[PDB]
Design a protein around this ligand. Structure first.
Ligand code: HEM
Ligand SMILES: O=C(O)c1ccc(Cc2ccccc2)cc1
Ligand SMILES: [Cl-]
Length: 393
């Protein structure tokens, strides 16, 4: 009843161009079986959304990667929020929801916006830049580690550790094995910065430790919660920003619309998150026999969700392959959906908005003027290099 496909969604061929195989996965049926890794797959919006919003049946505590924590040892101590189910997930989630809250965004928005304007002004003096290294990577690195309260030394570990985390969600392929092989120095840095004395007052990390006297988390839980904010947030925001720049370069009519109304900056970034989906895939594990899409999935089975495919499903989106900064993007699963829906989404939207705002006000044209190179990751989609010429407005 369930079609079996040999598509490897973690192969370099798939990463280079996933969209034809994603239609093949969508059109084969609501539920497929991937023989390469012995997992179930769902690539349509309806089933991805249904799985995300049933955390009791499709749990996260057995891992959101390929590895089943009931069968294998996690490569690092499990996250207290990402790899936890209700009710254990609830109170750590509440703390992070209060640390990265709407009220907290008010305290950081002016400095985030000023740094975005300053970076665009700096890049416009150079003219020809790499929109990945010099913009998509440089800007988050210029605001987020300071907002965390991290010291200056050792920040070069942040990008490798982020890429390692997302590669480790993948299958035991070469990308995952080499990442873990080189991981020891990055883990040692990250774990040490999670201790309370190493987090500057007023920052995100110090605020997490401050919640330890409320009864929501204990002091021994705070280091691992800080680790969450040093694992997530960087690479996805970098890829989302680089994707927005790539789209404004490939779709010049949308840059012109954004220039004419810079208040479209926030939705322009949200559409880039849907269009690119920096987090392409992750897993759930069934806790019981479940009926999904006419399929009887047994207990203890890994289910692979294709977030980027769900965000391009023509059953849900009109013209899904078009970048439209005025599209009604509400309902996209680029940040997930349900109880685990990205708790840092306000930080990501703030960074993306103020960067696209600076571009909208200061830049007249964005033209690719060099070879575009893709960055390969088991979980993340994004570019490695995006040579562009920025024309001042
Ligand atoms: C464009 C930027 C981002 C994207 C596309 C993204 C994507 C996602 C997705 C899809 C999930 C759901 C995970 C799941 O359901 O298993 C998630 C969760 C999470 N994200 Fe993000 N994220 C982004 C930015 C950030 C930022 C800026 C932060 C922190 C400052 C962050 C921290 C987290 C955390 C801690 C979780 C776990 C939440 C939970 O399990 O309840 N993310 N993210
Ligand atoms: O260490 C953590 O708690 C943590 C790490 C990464 C992420 C981002 C993500 C991971 C897998 C699937 C979708 C998104 C969230 C939380
Ligand atoms: Cl670690």
């Amino acid at each position: 009843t369930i079609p079996h496909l040999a598509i490897d969604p973690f192969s370099l061929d798939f990463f280079d161009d996933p969209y034809p195989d994603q239609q093949t996965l969508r059109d084969a049926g609501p539920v497929v079986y991937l023989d390469k890794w012995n997992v179930y797959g769902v690539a349509r919006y309806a089933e991805v959304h249904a799985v995300l919003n049933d955390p009791t049946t499709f749990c996260s505590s057995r891992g959101v990667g390929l590895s089943d924590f009931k069968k294998e040892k996690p490569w690092r101590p499990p996250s207290l929020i990402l790899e936890a189910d209700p009710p254990a997930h609830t109170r750590p989630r509440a703390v992070l929801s209060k640390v990265l809250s709407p009220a907290t965004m008010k305290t950081i928005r002016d400095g985030f916006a000023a740094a975005a304007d300053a970076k665009v002004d700096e890049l416009l003096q150079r003219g020809c830049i790499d929109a990945i290294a010099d913009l998509a990577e440089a800007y988050p690195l210029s605001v987020f580690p300071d907002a965390m309260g991290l010291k200056q030394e050792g920040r070069e570990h942040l990008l490798p550790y982020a890429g390692l985390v997302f590669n480790a969600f993948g299958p035991p392929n070469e990308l995952r094995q080499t990442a873990i092989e080189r991981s020891a120095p990055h883990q040692a840095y990250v774990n040490e910065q999670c201790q309370r004395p190493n987090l500057a007052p007023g920052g995100f990390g110090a605020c997490i430790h401050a919640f330890t006297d409320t009864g929501e988390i204990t002091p021994d839980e705070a280091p691992l919660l800080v680790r969450s904010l040093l694992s997530a947030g960087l690479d996805e925001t970098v890829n989302g920003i680089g994707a927005a720049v790539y789209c404004l370069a490939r779709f010049p009519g949308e840059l012109q619309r954004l220039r004419s109304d810079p208040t479209l900056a926030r939705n322009a970034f949200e559409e880039a998150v849907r269009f690119e989906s920096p987090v392409q895939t992750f897993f759930r594990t069934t806790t019981r026999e479940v009926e999904l899409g006419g399929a009887v999935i047994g207990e203890g089975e890994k289910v692979l969700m294709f977030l980027g495919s769900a965000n391009r499903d023509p059953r849900r989106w009109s013209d899904p392959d078009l970048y439209d900064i005025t599209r009604k993007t509400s309902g996209h699963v680029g940040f997930g959906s349900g109880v685990h829906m990205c708790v840092g989404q306000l930080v990501a939207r703030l960074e993306g908005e103020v960067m696209l705002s600076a571009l909208a006000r200061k830049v007249a044209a964005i033209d690719i003027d060099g070879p575009v190179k893709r960055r390969f990751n088991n979980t993340l989609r994004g570019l490695e290099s995006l040579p562009v010429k920025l024309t001042p407005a």
